Structures are given as C-alpha cells and as structure tokens.
Design a binder for this molecule. Structure first.
Ligand SMILES: CC(C)Nc1cccnc1N1CCN(C(=O)c2cc3cc(NS(C)(=O)=O)ccc3[nH]2)CC1
Lengths: 538, 405
C-alpha cells in the first residue's frame, strides 16, 4: 500500500454494488486462493470481512503459461458496469517521430503499482468477493480490496493520477529530465551524461519508494532497444521490427485477410507494398475456414512483399531547432504518399492515405484533404504544422481554390516537381464559345419502368435519341450530355436542365462514384473547350 | 454567498474532447492557468471528474498577451435558464468592450464547479493533460453575466444617468456602447466609461445606422444573347421563391428554338415590360418578414470567390431578415478560413447588435478544415453554433446579383 490521498469514487446514477454469486470451485483451487488471500491480507492489499456486506464479485483460479502455480482473478465485469465514468486515459500513445533524442534513456517498471495505490475507503465495500468452501456448505472466506483492484474500471486512471502527483515535485526540481507514464512503466530520459543520469534515476526510484511504489529487480528489467509496439528505439534512430509473412502452402480466408491486414499496415512504412491480387482471392468466399488457392499473380506479389519487408527502414527523432518538412506524392488516383522529415532522407515518419472512393471529387480537393490530415497529425505529434512540398503548381492551386464554392486552404507550402503532378484535368469555359456547336440536351426516363430516352438537337441540325432500358432519369440526363460530348467537335456549348449537372459546373469533378459521370469526365478532358449552361427545366 | 446553479432537468455535464493545440498555444495556456491557479480561480482536478470542455488560446486586437478562451457552448446549452434595446441598432457608432474580467470576483457554486472541467493537452501525448475546474464565474459561460447582473447594473447606472443618450447592452462577456456623438466625442465618452469600469476590476467601433438593406440589380444590355437571357431566366425563376410576382414567361418565349448561345435576340415589348415589372418587385424587400424571438436565427454564407462572400440571416426559408456581402480584409489574401472566420464574427456581431443573440451558421467549409484552423483567427469572446453545408449553385448566383455602390 502507500501514503497517498485516495480518489473519491462513486457508483453510477442510482445503481448499487454488484451482487453476483460465487462460482463453485474445487478444494484445489480453493486451497490455492486461500493462501494467496492470506498473503495479500497481510500485504494490506485486502481485508477479511463478513455479513455486513451484501455485495460480491466472483473470484476465479487459473495457473500461468506452460507452467504451474495457482494465481487468482476477480471478475469485476459487473462492478465495472456500475462504477462511475472517469477521465479518459491517454488512448493516443506518442509516436517516435515526435520523441526528442535523449542522450540517456531508462524505463522503470511499476507493475505492482495497481495494488500500491489505496482504494477509496468508502467504495471498498463494493469490491467484496468470496473464497468458496468445499462444495456449497460451510461459509467461505470473505474479503474486500483496500487498493486499486486489477481489472477494475477506475484503476488505470487513478493510478495515472497518483503517479502524476508523486512525479510533480521531482519534475519541477529538475526540468531537464523527461518522464513518460505508460501502463506500469515510466520512461525517463534526459540529456545528462550516463553517470548523472543514473544518479537522478536512483533519486527518482528512492522517491517513489518513499511513496510506496517499488521498482524492478535485476531480472525484471528492460534493457536493449525499447520494443515499443512495432518499433525498436535506438539512440541514433528507431527501426521497424520484423513483420513476418508466414510460409504456408495452404491459405484460408482468415489467413488471407489477416495477411492483407499486416500488408496494409506495412504500406505506411515500406514503399511498394501491394495487396491487389491478395484481396482478389476474397471474392465470393463462403467461410473463414475456406482454403483459397493462390493464383500465380498472388504468389508473385506475396514474393515481392516478402522482399520489400526485408529492407532496413529506419526513422529519426525530433529536433526542435530544425524545420518540419512534409512532401506528398500522388500514388495513383485517390492515393497519396507522404514523409515528414527535417534533414533530407532522414524521415521522422512516413505514411499513405488510402483513397476515399468518393461520390464526386477532384485531385486538388483530395490533395487538400491529405494536407489537412497531415497537419492535424503534425499538430498532435510536434505541436507544429510542417512546410509542405506539393507536386502541384502554385498556378494550378490559385486557379482552382480562388474559384471553388467551398472554403479550402493549404498552409505554407512550396512546389516540388516530382511527377506525376496533380492538375486540373479540364476547365469549363467562362462564357459561351462563339462558333462552336450548341447542343440542347435532354434525357427523360420513367422511374418505375426504368425505360427512357437520351438525346439532343443542335443549332446545326444534328440530332439523335437513344432508347435506354433499366435506366433512371439522372442517368438519361447525364447520358444526354455524354452523347452531346461524344458527337461534338473540340469546342462545344451544351445546355441542360439537369441541375444535377449544375453541380458539375460548380465543382468540376475529375472522379466520381458512377461510371457514367466518369465517361463524361473522360470526354470533357478530351475537348479543347466546353461550355456547360443550365436552364430551368420544363 | 454562492448562488446554487444547476443543470437543466435530465442533462449531464459536458464531455467535449479537447482538440489538439499548437506548442505556442499550450505554453500560453499553462502560464495563464498556473497564474489563475495561484490566484485561486481554478484548481487541479482528479480522474473522478469525467467532464470536459474545449479550451484554446486566442489573441485579439493589440497584443502578444495570449488570451485564454474556453468553448462553453455545450455547458451553456445544459445550464438552467434564469427567467433588448431597440435603439442600439439606430446608433451612429457602437463600441464593444470585454467585461469578462469581472467574473473572477464572484465565486461559483461549489456543486457546479465539476462541470467547468477543462484540459490543457500535451504534445505527442508525452504528458497527461493538465486538468482544472473553475472556482469562480467562468468567462464565456452564460451563467456568469446572469449571476453578475445585480452587480453589473449597479456599476453601470452612474454612467447611464450621466449619459442616458447612450445605450449600453450586455451579451456574454461583451458590452456594446452606442451613442450618436461624433467619433471623437463618442470615443472620449467611451474611455470615460472604461476609466469608470477600471476602478473596480476590468479592462475600434461599429456603425449600425450604415447597414443598408441592399436590393438585387438585374443586368441591362444593349444586346441580349440566348445565353444571357437563359442565365437571367434561371436566376429570375429561382427568385420566384421569394417574390412570387416575378415572371419569366415572355422571356422564355424568346428562348424557343435550338439557336446558338452566342446569337443575339431582340427583346419583344412584352418581354421588356416583364423585365421592367420584375425590377420593380426586386426594388424592395419581401413583405411580411418579422423576427420571432421564439425562433432560432439562421445565417447562411456562400463563397462568391475573389475574396467576396454573401450571407443571409433568416428564420424561415426565403423570408430574409437581413442579407449582406463581405469582402476580405487586407492581409487575408490567400486564406479562405481567415476570411470566413472574420465573416462569422462580423455577421454574429450584427446579429447581437440587432436581435441580441447569435445566429446558427451554415458554413460552406469542410468540418475538418474549419475545426483545424478557425481558432487561429478567432477574436471574439463568444462562439456561435455552426453546421457545415453544400452551397447550392443558384442561391450563390442570385445573391451575387446584389446591388453595390
Ligand atoms: C517510450 C517512448 C515514448 N520513448 C521515450 C519516452 C520518454 C522519454 N524518451 C523517450 N525516448 C526518446 C527517444 N529515444 C532516444 O533518444 C534513445 C534511445 C536510446 C537507446 C540507447 N541504448 S539501447 C537501450 O541499448 O538501445 C541509448 C540511448 C538512447 N536514446 C528513445 C527514448
């Protein structure tokens, strides 16, 4: 236990503590639980109680991995759903990119921390459980927790709070030391030389000791590159630890999906990772346990991925005195790749955004979106926005943004000519084209029969009408425009009453959800001049 | 003593997540908060408090001194209720003052404090956020000016009698002082009010009478083309939703035939009359439009382009209480989000001056874009409600047609 002020804990609005009955156990499990509970009882962690407590939680008995030593587990599942809500613990852990390079680093372990912090003496009654007796007869041994129970809702939050009160003094005393709380770990790093550093750590540890929190043993210590969730942190940089692809000549849907999972994650760091042919195998699958044979094409990319993954990708740490730069590349329609670095080729982080298969958009809009995503990301990691290097001419940007119906913006940036460059695939004319043919287009369809016609009549006498089956009115209207485009020269004036194409005039999209609009886009791109005019229908 | 404030029946405290802040902002908030902590205004809170309200650091006109600004919008909406000058709008010049600094003097009901819980974030989340709660009346909280009303009128009276030709209005942390005196005598009288305000505990202007109701001007031309007529008809047709007397028939008849867009069409006398009648109708605002205090005020804005923006304030679709245009301010040349924020603030100040409440905005900007950069250009103490929308191609086209000098 410890001499720290307890946190006032209460139950949700109007509820009562759990009253679940004790699961029946054997003489073996019981005898085990009894000894453990006698120990904890003396360590001060729990206290023997009695009838003055209607609450109860089921205690259980389990042994640990490839081994044998009876441990214990209390199912606070119920108490949890009845305990008040607490402040949200850091769900977003730091990222190596935002870590400042510290000359010396040290990670302490305070696993027992939970059972070291006292429980609100008022709330304690709710943590009562019972060690059963030999086959539902003699009353069992009753107890309750006096410390933060493992598995209980508020424990992580309360422990984190306590750790903060305790660390506040030390932190103030010597600000050149950076402490990080994570689970039962404290990652203390500084710019001091190893000797001075070790001295501070001992001071820190001894400080915690005064507060009841004991640290690691010569055995239970974390030494080499800190394997911090998929990353190995070295002094000079951080690396991506092995993401192994299994060699199985038998792949189930599960095996393929999981694989694609790993591969997709790998797409953020490793350049070139592809899963198209893998995903292809999922088509019409009838069960997780179904074995789908890898097509030659799948066996090939899997092989390439295996090679790409066996490459030494490594990141660097953050230096506040240096600029934050982010460069973006358009890896195909909708997909964008980026890398944020301070000094050339030394990336702090890389990543790519899959493509929001949108209803109706354009590259410049998408470039913007990637930019905003990166910014928020940067603000959260470095508390700063980067200088952008975008594969788009200022001229392209100016022309687009300055006339878009929606407020859009890109922070301080600079053009970097690294093909392919994002651009405006076409621009609708500002005024009618003198000389060019004028198509009066119209498509009408019976929404119920899904039968319609799409045609036009030009000022030059050209005319056409097409009958369509299983269509919709929107499709006919759009199709009308399509024909107009197909049958016209390099300069066209088109008038329609489809205020749905009026949407195209304002936004001028270069990609859509519908194949039809896409075709129209392909046509638009092909002309030298196109003037779209809308007129109220009927 | 402390007044027992409570939440509206059934409502729980706000649990709004704190948006990430820039390093500069965090440092500024920390300093500010340490001070207020020392001054006993706010206190560190524990994990037993699940509530939260956004906080950010602004800057306004005149300083580097970062001002702390909390987004109490949710708390305000959850705070119990505690139940306007018609001449303020007809004043030559109105000045705004930040009387938010007065609330720290009054303590907040202990049992309510938990709900004011806010949090200063940490970069890369290397440190848990610094949690605090208010012990005094918070700035930006609706309950503040209310509770402090007794004291407020008291301190204001002496100036009001010395100058009852001047109108003083209080909204949130603000005070709008409108007078009919000329600029110099007006401002000199305002500083007189401030000096008077300073011997207690706190620290340019508008011109309401200038807000002219601008009409719609229809194009006139030597020659009209098929396209010109078509564009005119489209807009007129849309306008019939407001003025049902507008007609496009005679004009539409000129549009009979598959002719070249660039072809010139001679206007028939009948069509000419129609255009004339239409111009007469658009010469004045639609009748029967009146403000209903029991209804939400709405503000829609459209990006006209080239730094121009149009807006309309209404409650019922098409029955506009006011319509206007905003040109970008010197400096905002490459920033839309700045122009928009500046616009929202300007439009909101008018709404307050005129109806004494903030309208609900329909902003032509992507949620993400807005939330990421609005604060960087925010300067007002209050924060209006907002929704993000897709601006219809015609609504823009019509208001673009508004009359200019
Ligand atoms: C828990 C996360 C958030 N990290 C972390 C938390 C709190 C403070 N600082 C941190 N990091 C800063 C960046 N960083 C280094 O600069 C670094 C690694 C390193 C390794 C050795 N030696 S070794 C063990 O054999 O690899 C010697 C010197 C070193 N310096 C790793 C630690």
């Amino acid at each position: 236990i410890s001499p720290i002020e307890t946190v006032p804990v209460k139950l949700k609005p109007g509820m009562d503590g759990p009253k679940v009955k004790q699961w029946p156990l054997t003489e073996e499990k019981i005898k085990a639980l009894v000894e453990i509970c006698t120990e904890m009882e003396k360590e001060g962690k729990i206290s023997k109680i009695g009838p003055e407590n209607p609450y109860n939680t089921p205690v259980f008995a389990i042994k640990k991995k490839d081994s044998t030593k009876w441990r214990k587990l209390v199912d606070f599942r119920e108490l949890n759903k009845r305990t008040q809500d607490f402040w949200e613990v850091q769900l977003g852990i730091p990222h190596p990119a935002g870590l400042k390079k510290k000359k010396s680093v040290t990670v302490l372990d305070v696993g027992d921390a939970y059972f070291s912090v006292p429980l609100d003496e008022d709330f304690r009654k709710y943590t009562a459980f019972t060690i059963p007796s030999i086959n539902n007869e003699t009353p069992g041994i009753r107890y309750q927790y006096n410390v933060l129970p493992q598995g209980w809702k508020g424990s992580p939050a309360i422990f984190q709070s306590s750790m903060t009160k305790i660390l506040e003094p030390f932190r103030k005393q010597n600000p050149d030391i950076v402490i990080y709380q994570y689970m039962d770990d404290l990652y203390v790093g500084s710019d001091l030389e190893i000797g001075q550093h070790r001295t501070k750590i001992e001071e820190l540890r001894q400080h915690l000791l005064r507060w009841g929190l004991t640290t690691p043993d010569k055995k239970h210590q974390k030494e080499p590159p800190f394997l911090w969730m998929g990353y190995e942190l070295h002094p000079d940089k951080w690396t991506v630890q092995p993401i192994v692809l299994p060699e199985k000549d038998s792949w189930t849907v599960n095996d393929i999906q999981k694989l694609v999972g790993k591969l997709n994650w790998a797409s953020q760091i490793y350049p070139g990772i592809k899963v198209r042919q893998l995903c292809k195998l999922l088509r019409g699958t009838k069960a997780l346990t179904e074995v789908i044979p890898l097509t030659e094409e799948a066996e090939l990319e899997l092989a390439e991925n295996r090679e790409i993954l066996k490459e030494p990708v490594h990141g660097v740490y953050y230096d506040p005195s240096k600029d934050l730069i982010a460069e973006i590349q358009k890896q195909g329609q909708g997909q964008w790749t980026y890398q944020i670095y301070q000094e050339p080729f030394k990336n702090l982080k890389t990543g790519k955004y899959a493509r929001m298969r949108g209803a109706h958009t354009n590259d410049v809009k998408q470039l913007t979106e990637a930019v905003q995503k990166i910014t928020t990301e940067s603000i959260v990691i470095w508390g700063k926005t980067p200088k952008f290097k975008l594969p788009i001419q200022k001229e392209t940007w100016e022309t687009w943004w300055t006339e878009y119906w929606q407020a859009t913006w890109i922070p301080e940036w600079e053009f970097v000519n690294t093909p392919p460059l994002v651009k405006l695939w076409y621009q609708l004319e500002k005024e009618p084209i003198v000389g060019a043919e004028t198509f009066y287009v119209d498509g009408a369809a019976n929404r119920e029969t899904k039968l319609g016609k799409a045609g036009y009549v030009t000022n030059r006498g050209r005319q056409k009408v097409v009958t369509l089956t299983d269509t919709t009115n929107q499709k006919t209207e759009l199709q009308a425009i399509y024909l107009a485009l197909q049958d016209s020269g390099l300069e066209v004036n088109i008038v329609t009453d489809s205020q749905y194409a009026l949407g195209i005039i304002q936004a001028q999209p270069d990609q859509s959800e519908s194949e039809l609009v896409n075709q129209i886009i392909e046509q638009l791109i092909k002309k030298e001049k196109v003037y779209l005019a809308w007129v109220p229908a009927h | 003593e402390t007044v027992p404030v409570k939440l509206k029946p059934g409502m729980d405290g706000p649990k709004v997540k704190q948006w990430p802040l820039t390093e500069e902002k965090i440092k500024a908030l920390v300093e500010i908060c340490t001070e207020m902590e020392k001054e006993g205004k706010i206190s560190k809170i524990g994990p037993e408090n699940p509530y939260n309200t956004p906080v950010f650091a602004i800057k306004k006109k005149d300083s580097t001194k970062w001002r702390k600004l909390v987004d109490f919008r949710e708390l305000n909406k959850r705070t119990q209720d505690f139940w306007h000058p018609a001449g303020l709008k007809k004043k030559k010049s109105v000045t705004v003052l930040d009387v938010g600094d007065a609330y720290f003097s009054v303590p907040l009901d202990e049992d309510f404090r938990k709900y004011t819980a806010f949090t200063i974030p940490s970069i890369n989340n290397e440190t848990p956020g610094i949690r605090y709660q208010y012990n005094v009346l918070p700035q930006g909280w609706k309950g503040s000016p209310a509770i402090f009303q007794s004291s407020m009128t008291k301190i204001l009276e002496p100036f009001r009698k010395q100058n009852p030709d001047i109108v003083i209005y209080q909204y949130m942390d603000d005070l709008y002082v409108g007078s009919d005196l000329e600029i110099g005598q007006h401002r000199t009288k305002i500083e007189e009010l401030r000096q008077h305000l300073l011997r207690w505990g706190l620290t340019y202007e508008l011109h309401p009478d200038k807000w002219t109701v601008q009409p719609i001007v229809l194009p006139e031309k030597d020659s009209w083309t098929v396209n010109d007529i078509q564009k005119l008809v489209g807009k007129l047709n849309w306008a019939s939703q407001i003025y049902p007397g507008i007609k496009v028939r005679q004009l539409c008849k000129l549009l009979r035939g598959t002719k070249a867009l660039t072809e010139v069409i001679p206007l028939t006398e009948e069509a000419e009359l129609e255009l004339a009648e239409n111009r007469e109708i658009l010469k004045e605002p639609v009748h029967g439009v009146y403000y209903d205090p029991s209804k939400d005020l709405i503000a829609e804005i459209q990006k006209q382009g080239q730094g121009q923006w149009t807006y309309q304030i209404y409650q019922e679709p098409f029955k506009n209480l006011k319509t206007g245009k905003y040109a970008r301010m010197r400096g905002a040349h490459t920033n839309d989000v700045k122009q928009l924020t500046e616009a929202v603030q300007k439009i909101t100040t008018e709404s307050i001056v005129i109806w004494g409440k903030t309208p609900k905005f329909k902003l032509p900007i992507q949620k993400e874009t807005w939330e990421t950069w609005w604060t960087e250009y925010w300067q007002a103490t209050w924060i209006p409600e907002w929704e993000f929308v897709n601006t219809p191609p015609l609504v823009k086209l019509w208001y673009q047609l508004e009359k200019e000098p």
